[PDB]
Ligand binder design. Structure first.
Ligand SMILES: [Ca+2]
Length: 303
């Protein structure tokens, strides 16, 4: 049985080939790690490779776990062919991408419309950069026109789907939280956003900023009345002990927050994004690390 089986909020994980073994025995919600990024689906213009995204969606439905679509608009892993197209043609391609996802996947629990607006807008012309910011109106009058246009498109094409914004390095500072909330404020003028996501990777939760500051900033995000999701949680494990200590220090602050409606770990087996930093909770030999032993007991004790 998954760790959060009897909890009031989900505990999910990034799903993909290396995260697949025993997945449903641990987690009760998923996000496709890479297959839902536009560059993964439409690497070649007007031919859609849905295989990896289908795999994640099929698995989620078969195990009756909520599916978070990751991700519609982002500044990495976007198609290469779109970069040099005129803004009018880029926009038509974006709209087609939105309509295609909406048609194929009607049971999306949370649609991540824009990821990393404060950190990685689709304004670069490098590998996977997209370079389509101006197709969505660029900064515009508010400074975040492109975000507004992305969520407007999401509302139009996904009329019954919960819409989420996602970003990193938010709760680590009041200034970043206030910046992020300006975007949320602009979105709420047209009631365009339903959920607030913060990634909370290991680099976001280091101890030089106290967890109480993270909690205060969670309160600030919660003041919007919108549900909060922790979307891409990981903690490094150069030693088992450091990982265990960090899990004890950091995880409860997010898990116990009343506005947090779910946490998704960004992988749990080797091959996850922060493999080099040993953020995995299960070793190469299949054995559970002390942080995971603790996590199961902690989650069971906190429904
Ligand atoms: Ca197309």
């Amino acid at each position: 049985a998954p760790l959060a089986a009897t909890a009031s909020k989900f505990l999910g994980c990034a799903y993909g080939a290396q995260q697949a073994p025993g997945f449903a025995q641990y987690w009760n919600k998923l996000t496709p790690e890479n297959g839902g990024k536009w560059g993964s689906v439409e690497a070649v213009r007007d031919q859609m490779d849905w295989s990896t995204l289908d795999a994640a969606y099929r698995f989620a439905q078969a195990n009756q776990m909520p599916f978070q679509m990751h991700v519609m608009v982002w500044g990495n892993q976007q198609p290469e062919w779109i970069k040099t197209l005129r803004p009018a043609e880029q926009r038509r391609e974006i709209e087609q991408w939105f309509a295609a996802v909406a048609q194929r996947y009607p049971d999306i629990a949370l649609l991540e419309v824009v990821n990393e607006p404060l950190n990685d807008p689709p304004s670069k012309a490098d590998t996977g950069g997209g370079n389509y910011l101006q197709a969505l109106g660029g900064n515009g009058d508010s400074g975040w026109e492109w975000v507004l246009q992305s969520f407007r498109l999401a509302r139009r094409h996904f009329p019954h789907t919960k819409l989420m914004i996602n970003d990193y390095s938010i709760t680590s500072s009041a200034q970043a939280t206030q910046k992020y909330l300006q975007i949320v404020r602009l979105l709420q003028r047209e009631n365009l956003v339903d959920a607030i996501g913060v990634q909370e990777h290991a680099f976001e939760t280091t101890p030089e900023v106290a967890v109480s500051v993270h909690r205060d900033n969670l309160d600030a995000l919660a003041a919007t009345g919108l549900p909060i999701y922790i979307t891409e949680f990981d903690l490094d494990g150069p030693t088992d002990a450091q990982q265990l200590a960090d899990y004890k220090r950091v995880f409860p602050v997010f898990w116990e927050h009343p506005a947090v409606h779910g946490i998704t770990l960004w992988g749990f087996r080797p091959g996850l994004w922060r493999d080099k930093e040993a953020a995995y909770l299960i070793r190469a030999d299949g054995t559970e690390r002390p942080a995971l032993t603790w996590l199961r007991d902690y989650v069971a004790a906190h429904p």
